[PDB]
Amino acid sequence: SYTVTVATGSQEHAGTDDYIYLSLVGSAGCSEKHLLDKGSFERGAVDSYDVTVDEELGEIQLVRIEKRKYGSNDDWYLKYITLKTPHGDYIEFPCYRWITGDVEVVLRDGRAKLARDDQIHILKQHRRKELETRQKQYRWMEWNPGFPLSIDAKCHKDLPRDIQFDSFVLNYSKAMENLFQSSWNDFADFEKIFVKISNTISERVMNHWQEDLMFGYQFLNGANPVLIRRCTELPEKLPVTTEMVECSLERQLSLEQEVQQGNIFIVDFELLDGIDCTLQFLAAPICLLYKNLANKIVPIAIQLNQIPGDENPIFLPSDAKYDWLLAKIWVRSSDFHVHQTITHLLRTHLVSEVFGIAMYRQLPAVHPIFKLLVAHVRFTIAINTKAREQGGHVQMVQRAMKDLTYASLCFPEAIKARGMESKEDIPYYFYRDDGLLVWEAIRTFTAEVVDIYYEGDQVVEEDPELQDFVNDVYVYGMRGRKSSGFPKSVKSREQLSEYLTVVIFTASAQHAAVNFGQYDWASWIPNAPPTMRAPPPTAKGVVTIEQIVDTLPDRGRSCWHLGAVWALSQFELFLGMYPEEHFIEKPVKEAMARFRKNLEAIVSVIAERNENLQLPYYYLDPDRIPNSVA
Numbered sequence: 269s270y271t272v273t274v275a276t277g278s279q280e281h282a283g284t285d286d287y288i289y290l291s292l293v294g295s296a297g298c299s300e301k302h303l304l305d306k307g308s309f310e311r312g313a314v315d316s317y318d319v320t321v322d323e324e325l326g327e328i329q330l331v332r333i334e335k336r337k338y339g340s341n342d343d344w345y346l347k348y349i350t351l352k353t354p355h356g357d358y359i360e361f362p363c364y365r366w367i368t369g370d371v372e373v374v375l376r377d378g379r380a381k382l383a384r385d386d387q388i389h390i391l392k393q394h395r396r397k398e399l400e401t402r403q404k405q406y407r408w409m410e411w412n413p414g415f416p417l418s419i420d421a422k423c424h425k426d427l428p429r430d431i432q433f434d435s436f437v438l439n440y441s442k443a444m445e446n447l448f449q450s451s452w453n454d455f456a457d458f459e460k461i462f463v464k465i466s467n468t469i470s471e472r473v474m475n476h477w478q479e480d481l482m483f484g485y486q487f488l489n490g491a492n493p494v495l496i497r498r499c500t501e502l503p504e505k506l507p508v509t510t511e512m513v514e515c516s517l518e519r520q521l522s523l524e525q526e527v528q529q530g531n532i533f534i535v536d537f538e539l540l541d542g543i544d545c546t547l548q549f550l551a552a553p554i555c556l557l558y559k560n561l562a563n564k565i566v567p568i569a570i571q572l573n574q575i576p577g578d579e580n581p582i583f584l585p586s587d588a589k590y591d592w593l594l595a596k597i598w599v600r601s602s603d604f605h606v607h608q609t610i611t612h613l614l615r616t617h618l619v620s621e622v623f624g625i626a627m628y629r630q631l632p633a634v635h636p637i638f639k640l641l642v643a644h645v646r647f648t649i650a651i652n653t654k655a656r657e658q659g660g661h662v663q664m665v666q667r668a669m670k671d672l673t674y675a676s677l678c679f680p681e682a683i684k685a686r687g688m689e690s691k692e693d694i695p696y697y698f699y700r701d702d703g704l705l706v707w708e709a710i711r712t713f714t715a716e717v718v719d720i721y722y723e724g725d726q727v728v729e730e731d732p733e734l735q736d737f738v739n740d741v742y743v744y745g746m747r748g749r750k751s752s753g754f755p756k757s758v759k760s761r762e763q764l765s766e767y768l769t770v771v772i773f774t775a776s777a778q779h780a781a782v783n784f785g786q787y788d789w790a791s792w793i794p795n796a797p798p799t800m801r802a803p804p805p806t807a808k809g810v811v812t813i814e815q816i817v818d819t820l821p822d823r824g825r826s827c828w829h830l831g832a833v834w835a836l837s838q839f840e841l842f843l844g845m846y847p848e849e850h851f852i853e854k855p856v857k858e859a860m861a862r863f864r865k866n867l868e869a870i871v872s873v874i875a876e877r878n879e880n881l882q883l884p885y886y887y888l889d890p891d892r893i894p895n896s897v898a
């Protein structure tokens with residue numbers, strides 16, 4: 269007598285009323301199709317059955333689930349199935365899939381298996397037929413020329429039910445309704461709404477956004493701290509002199525000497541150079557920054573376009589108040605657009621989707637890498653499709669593709685390439701510090717999982733599904749661009765560990781850092797103008813508060829930009845939380861546990877650090893890092 273346990277999901281529509289047939293597949297034969305008829309399958313419910321089988325099945329290999337339409341189609345989310353055999357064996361079959369009535373689902377037991385592990389027909393056929401199905405279901409498509417490839421789906425509902433997301437034209441509605449308690453006339457001015465809705469940081473930004481210290485602070489610990497790099501030599505396009513900035517320098521060194529000492533930093537928006545209300549794209553600023561005596565980064569010079577000239581002045585903190593202020597606003601404007609389109613959209617969302625699609629196409633559910641990654645990438649596809657389904661930013665993505673390299677996705681390596689690695693030359697870079705801690709924890713975790721399933725480098729290289737996975741990413745996701753630096757194949761356990769870390773870190777930690785600071789730093793519009801309604805100033809001394817108000821977005825229109833950021837504020841599975849148990853084996857369960865302990869240690873490290881800070885950095889606190897881009 270077999271004891272069969274079927275667990276239904278707890279999503280709103282997890283439950284089904286349809287007919288459920290179940291049969292077992294053993295080495296010595298198959299049982300017949302048993303209708304699970306008693307009651308129905310309700311959300312959150314677990315259902316157990318006693319099933320007497322005719323013949324000896326041998327060792328159970330597979331479980332066949334069939335959903336027969338009963339009335340209208342009622343989608344059914346199956347978490348897992350367990351078996352208690354008459355021989356006393358306890359077998360678990362992970363599923364975590366939406367089941368429709370148009371097909372039959374077949375599950376392996378929870379133990380993770382490489383292709384070289386399966387040498388009997390029953391297992392080889394299932395594995396091969398599953399990939400065949402995957403590769404019809406999940407296909408590549410070019411949404412826009414030059415873009416990384418994404419899922420072949422025009423809309424969200426055209427996605428396989430498996431990767432569909434239960435379910436921001438709404439957010440708009442959310443902000444509006446929830447906001448009201450106000451009057452309809454509050455929408456005439458965003459600031460009328462702002463004081464009603466302020467967190468600690470945004471209120472700080474409203475009061476201090478005009479300060480050079482806060483301006484420079486954001487390049488390190490703001491919503492988009494990935495642009496700043498150490499300047500080893502003054503670019504010809506920026507004809508700044510010691511005399512121009514002497515007032516800012518504090519070490520009795522010339523500008524040139526400060527550069528050699530590694531005290532000069534630069535943010536260069538040449539990505540915005542050549543782009544076509546569109547006016548924000550008239551600028552492609554170069555911001556020069558200085559590490560003062562207190563080891564704080566402050567702006568010392570700003571040129572709003574790339575080509576130096578009489579129509580393109582170098583603005584300084586010694587200029588008229590409103591000259592300097594408007595220059596900074598333009599840099600904040602540029603940082604905002606790069607952050608939204610490049611740092612956020614391209615380098616976390618689209619990248620994660622590439623990994624997700626390649627995973628589904630090339631890795632069967634039983635593969636250890638599927639079990640590992642599925643929690644971090646699964647819903648990136650649906651979310652990206654929703655964003656897609658409802659010109660300058662397109663050009664930006666195209667131009668940034670050249671810079672989308674594998675090396676730039678490896679955190680420690682990326683920090684280094686920007687010359688920002690030194691903790692002692694740049695002590696107040698909290699995104700770096702926390703980033704490195706989290707990256708190291710994921711690196712340790714992935715490495716352990718790899719060592720458990722891959723006995724040595726040779727096993728990695730000879731894993732055909734892993735090789736196709738990597739190859740799909742390189743050829744399709746990254747368009748086979750050689751300069752991308754992505755591996756065509758993975759030949760060692762270390763290389764594999766690093767690659768998996770790239771995927772998980774990008775979808776979780778990196779995304780959290782560049783996403784969850786959006787409201788803190790962008791809710792006060794003047795610090796993050798989504799649009800600019802006037803061209804950059806082309807002369808010194810002519811700027812007035814009128815021109816600044818005319819350049820900034822309309823006060824009323826800003827309510828909507830504010831609403832968006834705040835509604836999004838309102839909203840989870842966090843890093844290390846794996847309630848969906850694809851892995852069922854003791855060794856990997858122990859690695860997961862060690863992962864969570866390493867994370868908790870980082871949580872304490874960060875907490876203790878934040879108490880000594882005037883403006884705490886909590887974006888990379890593992891307690892707040894989601895598993896995926898969700």
Ligand SMILES: CCCCC/C=C\C/C=C\C/C=C\C/C=C\CCCC(=O)O
Pocket residue numbers: 435436438608651832836898
């Ligand atoms: C109900 C599910 C909601 C899912 C939300 C998923 C991700 C969105 C998160 C942040 C990104 C959203 C927008 C950020 C900035 C504004 C874009 C405005 C575009 C426009 O209007 O011109």
Ligand SMILES: [Fe+2]
Pocket residue numbers: 612617779783897
């Ligand atoms: Fe996001």
